[PDB]
Amino acid sequence: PIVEIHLLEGYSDAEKERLGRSLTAAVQTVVPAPPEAITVMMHEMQAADYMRGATRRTPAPALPDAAATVRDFLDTMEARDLDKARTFLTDDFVMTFPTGRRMTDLSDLVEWSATRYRFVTKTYDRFDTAATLDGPVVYCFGTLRGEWPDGTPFDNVRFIDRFALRDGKLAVQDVWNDLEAMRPRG
Amino acid sequence: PIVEIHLLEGYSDAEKERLGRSLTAAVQTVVPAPPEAITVMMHEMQAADYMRGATRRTPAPALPDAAATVRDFLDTMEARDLDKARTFLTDDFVMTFPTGRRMTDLSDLVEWSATRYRFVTKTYDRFDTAATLDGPVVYCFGTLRGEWPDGTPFDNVRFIDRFALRDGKLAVQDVWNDLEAMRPRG
Amino acid sequence: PIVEIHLLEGYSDAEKERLGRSLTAAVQTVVPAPPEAITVMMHEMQAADYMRGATRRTPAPALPDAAATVRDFLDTMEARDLDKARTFLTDDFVMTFPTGRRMTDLSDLVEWSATRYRFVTKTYDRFDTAATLDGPVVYCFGTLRGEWPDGTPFDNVRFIDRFALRDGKLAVQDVWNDLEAMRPRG
Amino acid sequence: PIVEIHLLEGYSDAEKERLGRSLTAAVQTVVPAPPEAITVMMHEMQAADYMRGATRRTPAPALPDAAATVRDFLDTMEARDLDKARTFLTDDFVMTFPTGRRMTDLSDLVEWSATRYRFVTKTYDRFDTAATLDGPVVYCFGTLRGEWPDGTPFDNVRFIDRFALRDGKLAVQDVWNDLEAMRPRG
Amino acid sequence: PIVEIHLLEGYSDAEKERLGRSLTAAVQTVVPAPPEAITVMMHEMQAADYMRGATRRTPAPALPDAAATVRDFLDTMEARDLDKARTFLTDDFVMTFPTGRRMTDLSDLVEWSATRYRFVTKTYDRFDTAATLDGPVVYCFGTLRGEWPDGTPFDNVRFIDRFALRDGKLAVQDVWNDLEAMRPRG
Amino acid sequence: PIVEIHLLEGYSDAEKERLGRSLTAAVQTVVPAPPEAITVMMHEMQAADYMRGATRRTPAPALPDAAATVRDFLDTMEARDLDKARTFLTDDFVMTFPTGRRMTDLSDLVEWSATRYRFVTKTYDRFDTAATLDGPVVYCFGTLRGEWPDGTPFDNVRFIDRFALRDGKLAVQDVWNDLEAMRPRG
Known part of the structure; x- marks a missing residue:
């Protein structure tokens, strides 16, 4: 299974790593694939490349671990x-x-x-x-x-x-x- | 955040639902967005439409709840x-x-x-x-x-x-x- | 340019037609590419495949022309x-x-x-x-x-x-x- | 609905905003959704990341408003x-x-x-x-x-x-x- | 590497398999990955789901092997x-x-x-x-x-x-x- | 046909060119389309944006010609x-x-x-x-x-x-x- 997540720029490498691991395990609660069959790709967007409601959006600052x-x-x-x-x-x-x-x-x-x-x-x-x-x-x-x-x-x-x-x-x-x-x- | 997951056809609606909820919650361990700001899209593939190492793959039958x-x-x-x-x-x-x-x-x-x-x-x-x-x-x-x-x-x-x-x-x-x-x- | 749109299943061919032409034209208000250089792809999701806020969304009926x-x-x-x-x-x-x-x-x-x-x-x-x-x-x-x-x-x-x-x-x-x-x- | 558009690099933030709003409105001519339910994501490609015909393309300089x-x-x-x-x-x-x-x-x-x-x-x-x-x-x-x-x-x-x-x-x-x-x- | 190919409905399972193998091999002429690291996903579109120059398009009948x-x-x-x-x-x-x-x-x-x-x-x-x-x-x-x-x-x-x-x-x-x-x- | 490939940052322009031409030619072994009907888009990911098996991949240098x-x-x-x-x-x-x-x-x-x-x-x-x-x-x-x-x-x-x-x-x-x-x- 291949997971893609689109998010706004500004999350750190360590936060991306948590998110990637979290998304991978989520998949494993339903699909009994080994982690190595599971890919996570993250697409980072600049504020100008994203709109919702015809409006740019502010990234939610990351939760700590x-x-x-x-x-x-x-x-x-x-x-x-x-x-x-x-x-x-x-x-x-x-x-x-x-x-x-x-x-x-x-x-x-x-x-x-x-x-x-x-x-x-x-x-x-x-x-x-x-x-x-x-x-x-x-x-x-x-x-x-x-x-x-x-x-x-x-x-x-x-x-x-x-x-x-x-x-x-x-x-x-x-x-x-x-x-x-x-x-x-x- | 927008989450996309590509998976082989065959999972039940209830399985997709658990999967979507797990993926939504996985995002929330890092990005504190209101669940309303979190989208999950599932792309279902026929066996013939998916390949890794140049071979089709077996749908790993879903785990139970x-x-x-x-x-x-x-x-x-x-x-x-x-x-x-x-x-x-x-x-x-x-x-x-x-x-x-x-x-x-x-x-x-x-x-x-x-x-x-x-x-x-x-x-x-x-x-x-x-x-x-x-x-x-x-x-x-x-x-x-x-x-x-x-x-x-x-x-x-x-x-x-x-x-x-x-x-x-x-x-x-x-x-x-x-x-x-x-x-x-x- | 290449436009992708993801939407719930159930729009008619004529409705998809209207939406494709409208999206093409929108692009031409900024990018003066010839219409033939503009592609629109529509991805269709069953209700089970789409979730915002950990909830499936009910598909509306398309607006009339x-x-x-x-x-x-x-x-x-x-x-x-x-x-x-x-x-x-x-x-x-x-x-x-x-x-x-x-x-x-x-x-x-x-x-x-x-x-x-x-x-x-x-x-x-x-x-x-x-x-x-x-x-x-x-x-x-x-x-x-x-x-x-x-x-x-x-x-x-x-x-x-x-x-x-x-x-x-x-x-x-x-x-x-x-x-x-x-x-x-x- | 989620709209993605892939375009070559070079458009200004203001041009992207116009395009985003036009695409959002286009969707609203068919799908009766509030603007708030409609996302537009733009993927920008450098010349080396894009090919049509085994040859590269030059972007069309934007139209004015x-x-x-x-x-x-x-x-x-x-x-x-x-x-x-x-x-x-x-x-x-x-x-x-x-x-x-x-x-x-x-x-x-x-x-x-x-x-x-x-x-x-x-x-x-x-x-x-x-x-x-x-x-x-x-x-x-x-x-x-x-x-x-x-x-x-x-x-x-x-x-x-x-x-x-x-x-x-x-x-x-x-x-x-x-x-x-x-x-x-x- | 993840390869995606979008194409019109109508290709046989065998045609898709040839296509997937050729895309995998192409990647291997530049990226030194084993085939097992290379995924190909095909997204098939009905005619109504695809538009170029605001018109539907007819697939090219496949070539034989x-x-x-x-x-x-x-x-x-x-x-x-x-x-x-x-x-x-x-x-x-x-x-x-x-x-x-x-x-x-x-x-x-x-x-x-x-x-x-x-x-x-x-x-x-x-x-x-x-x-x-x-x-x-x-x-x-x-x-x-x-x-x-x-x-x-x-x-x-x-x-x-x-x-x-x-x-x-x-x-x-x-x-x-x-x-x-x-x-x-x- | 539209090919997308996702790969790690660091390939040279010339490497991407070879890879794009190869993907294009791969399509043409099955779909006899004219090359200007075939587009290739490359999405570059930073190391931190790509995971397989919950771990990042080390990019291996491109092969020579x-x-x-x-x-x-x-x-x-x-x-x-x-x-x-x-x-x-x-x-x-x-x-x-x-x-x-x-x-x-x-x-x-x-x-x-x-x-x-x-x-x-x-x-x-x-x-x-x-x-x-x-x-x-x-x-x-x-x-x-x-x-x-x-x-x-x-x-x-x-x-x-x-x-x-x-x-x-x-x-x-x-x-x-x-x-x-x-x-x-x-």
């Missing part, structure tokens, strides 16, 4: 830099953590987790980006290492995060993980 | 019809459940889960399909209702499933949920 | 079949005749016109259709023959009509002619 | 600069004014009109271009202000002009107006 | 069916065989060859078709088996034929071979 | 400059000469031919390049002049060479000629 934004945010939270972390977030950002704990302030999350473990560090197995008609959604999963409250080190505890975005910013975060399934009880 | 395949599998599992559930699976299908329990035989899952709760029933908040270069990956999440082993009822226990597919069959299942986080402890 | 509609209306007026004439008009149709006489009701025109001449019959020299971004606009000019109020015959009195259309119906008529220039004065 | 040419000729005539006015004209230019007065010399028209009014100056309500296969045809209409021969001022006397062009110059002019309909009579 | 025509002529000469062989030929067909012997009558070739060998039968290693703008040119080469005039058998005597064609018919034949280089000498 | 390479090599062999002549050859180059003599060392050809004639020089009637799916194949033919071993001059002895190329180098040479047919015999 949603998976990179999520990783940057999650890195910034591990560095405990809440000021910087907030710059990734919409005004109405909402987090849901295990138990259904719903929170809108990053400080609330620090206090709530403080007693659940001393710290946790993420190892990422995978980032998947789900393209929706409401923009991208990011899933990332892997394992946690850290220490329980009494200091006991743990390791290889599975986690997954889901982020929904709006206009490039993180708008919703949901978290599921295996901490309470691996916590020592007896 | 992966989210619907996942939903049907999970429904069948809830009906405890393991004979049918296995018709969804690759021969090397592997499941990972909370604690990192890695299982390849649905029977193993039944026995392992039997002690952890009497039953669960899934309410689905959302499916998302992540188009990858290895094919579709399906994420679905929502909440569980059921009973703890002592017969105590629960509901609204968060869960998330991830499925990776291969040639229209389910190849990998990973599961994360809030059961151990919500389970009553003396 | 505006110049024929005008001719038909003017013919009906000459036959004095007002009921039929009105079927050609928008509810807000407006006429402007020499002296700037502005009229909305066909019956107003026959009354106003009756004192000006016994009758007029149009010979058409030319129709022209101007493609505008509000729709087609038709111009037709030629000569009138008739009799002045006292019965004196006349012939070859120049006239021109302009019609603006909306959705295939006649929305504005402007009229200009040489009657008063040629009228006998005692 | 016929409506601007007409307006400039008419402005010039209002300034009474007949030397300049003639540079707009084909050698066989022919004029027809109310009464069927057929004229080839601009000085003829000056003499003939001098009897008819002291002066008139045009206010333009609209320009329309009819794209035809023999090149553009220009219609413009509006009103005249001026003075009758005895010095009585008039105002809002309707007029319409039609110009046929040949290779960018004015070849035929036809005029119709309400001057004799509005003239005071005895 | 030049290399098959040659093979058929040569097979016919091996069965010695001269009357049939002359149906492949232009009225001014010319042959040139080793020693420079030029001949226009097939029966002249029969008499000349008679004393050079008892018979010869062609095994074809290859046909190559040279796409020139002045007509097709067919080269074919391989080996001969047969018997010298004294009955002594031979095989693997190399041969090559060149044929120029005109409007589907064989117009020139040139032959070179190793018979005299292999002939036994006293 | 095969018929020129062949001519250069043959001129160099006439000059007896084997060192230079070998720069044109693949490492697995193979020659077949009359009698089926198969040689891989240019030195071998000089020994073998030295006893067959004093020298020959080629007068070329024609080069034909055949576009094949294995790459370009060059045929050139004409006549030889030289001297038999005893010094007796000859001229007008027919010859034909066939070269197959690989990555712009000569990989196979086959030769057929009338030398043994014209040699004086005791």
Whole structure:
């Protein structure tokens, strides 16, 4: 299958590369061709060579790479830099953590987790980006290492995060993980 | 943006529809245009009209709707019809459940889960399909209702499933949920 | 130059003909290439093959030929079949005749016109259709023959009509002619 | 509908805009779509990227905007600069004014009109271009202000002009107006 | 590289296959890509979908396969069916065989060859078709088996034929071979 | 017919010219259209605008003009400059000469031919390049002049060479000629 996309000039090489990869995978959700049977060609237009409604149009500035934004945010939270972390977030950002704990302030999350473990560090197995008609959604999963409250080190505890975005910013975060399934009880 | 895709004739209307929606959404991971500003045009070719390496090509028969395949599998599992559930699976299908329990035989899952709760029933908040270069990956999440082993009822226990597919069959299942986080402890 | 147009299936051959000639002529308003150096290709899409905003589009019916509609209306007026004439008009149709006489009701025109001449019959020299971004606009000019109020015959009195259309119906008529220039004065 | 046009490099942004608008309007003579639903994409080729006959082609230098040419000729005539006015004209230019007065010399028209009014100056309500296969045809209409021969001022006397062009110059002019309909009579 | 060709309906599947292979090969005379990297797509248009100079156009009836025509002529000469062989030929067909012997009558070739060998039968290693703008040119080469005039058998005597064609018919034949280089000498 | 080819930027004007003429000639092997009915359009893509298998292609430099390479090599062999002549050859180059003599060392050809004639020089009637799916194949033919071993001059002895190329180098040479047919015999 051969995909052509006509777009206005001004997107970077890295943005074209994301788009090309995204278009290729889209095809594979229906057509079981190997990526190597799938071609994407991009035709760039200058503003004077494009009109819609008898009117030139302004290119929509590119969204950042949603998976990179999520990783940057999650890195910034591990560095405990809440000021910087907030710059990734919409005004109405909402987090849901295990138990259904719903929170809108990053400080609330620090206090709530403080007693659940001393710290946790993420190892990422995978980032998947789900393209929706409401923009991208990011899933990332892997394992946690850290220490329980009494200091006991743990390791290889599975986690997954889901982020929904709006206009490039993180708008919703949901978290599921295996901490309470691996916590020592007896 | 205008997307054109050239493909061999034979795909159903519903397949073209999924394909067009996936392509539209793929654009939106980079170009934040209103879906109204995004056009998809499909050019259908007869076998005789298309050639690569100087030879006609075989129409690769369409994949099914992966989210619907996942939903049907999970429904069948809830009906405890393991004979049918296995018709969804690759021969090397592997499941990972909370604690990192890695299982390849649905029977193993039944026995392992039997002690952890009497039953669960899934309410689905959302499916998302992540188009990858290895094919579709399906994420679905929502909440569980059921009973703890002592017969105590629960509901609204968060869960998330991830499925990776291969040639229209389910190849990998990973599961994360809030059961151990919500389970009553003396 | 080579013009490609992509459109939904279901236009007749004659409609495709009109569209091809119109596109060719548009090119000739800027590029003084001979018509033979201008190619038009039409790609036809089934509904299933075309999507904007993740939605199939319903194919409209083609507009009638505006110049024929005008001719038909003017013919009906000459036959004095007002009921039929009105079927050609928008509810807000407006006429402007020499002296700037502005009229909305066909019956107003026959009354106003009756004192000006016994009758007029149009010979058409030319129709022209101007493609505008509000729709087609038709111009037709030629000569009138008739009799002045006292019965004196006349012939070859120049006239021109302009019609603006909306959705295939006649929305504005402007009229200009040489009657008063040629009228006998005692 | 999506219109693509392939043309050789060299046309200015303004020429491209004219062409884009003409193609858009052309579509609207058959397909009842709002301009907003109609896209025009231009693909520009360098000489080395284009071949017809195993040989290259030289682009036809663009036509000027016929409506601007007409307006400039008419402005010039209002300034009474007949030397300049003639540079707009084909050698066989022919004029027809109310009464069927057929004229080839601009000085003829000056003499003939001098009897008819002291002066008139045009206010333009609209320009329309009819794209035809023999090149553009220009219609413009509006009103005249001026003075009758005895010095009585008039105002809002309707007029319409039609110009046929040949290779960018004015070849035929036809005029119709309400001057004799509005003239005071005895 | 992606090659697209737009053409009128009416070509057979076999004609399209020849066309696709020739376009692929053409690309390979300049672009050093393997055929598997070269895609050809054909867009077929009904007559109503195509316009040049604002008129429909009639497809040129396809040419026959030049290399098959040659093979058929040569097979016919091996069965010695001269009357049939002359149906492949232009009225001014010319042959040139080793020693420079030029001949226009097939029966002249029969008499000349008679004393050079008892018979010869062609095994074809290859046909190559040279796409020139002045007509097709067919080269074919391989080996001969047969018997010298004294009955002594031979095989693997190399041969090559060149044929120029005109409007589907064989117009020139040139032959070179190793018979005299292999002939036994006293 | 209208051919479009999409390819990476970087081909020279002369390379595009060869490619356009070749595509044109390819069409003409099937569609006997006049060359001015055949247009070729080339669409150039930047590296970042083209993907296959979700990865960009590295453009490989255009092939040289095969018929020129062949001519250069043959001129160099006439000059007896084997060192230079070998720069044109693949490492697995193979020659077949009359009698089926198969040689891989240019030195071998000089020994073998030295006893067959004093020298020959080629007068070329024609080069034909055949576009094949294995790459370009060059045929050139004409006549030889030289001297038999005893010094007796000859001229007008027919010859034909066939070269197959690989990555712009000569990989196979086959030769057929009338030398043994014209040699004086005791």
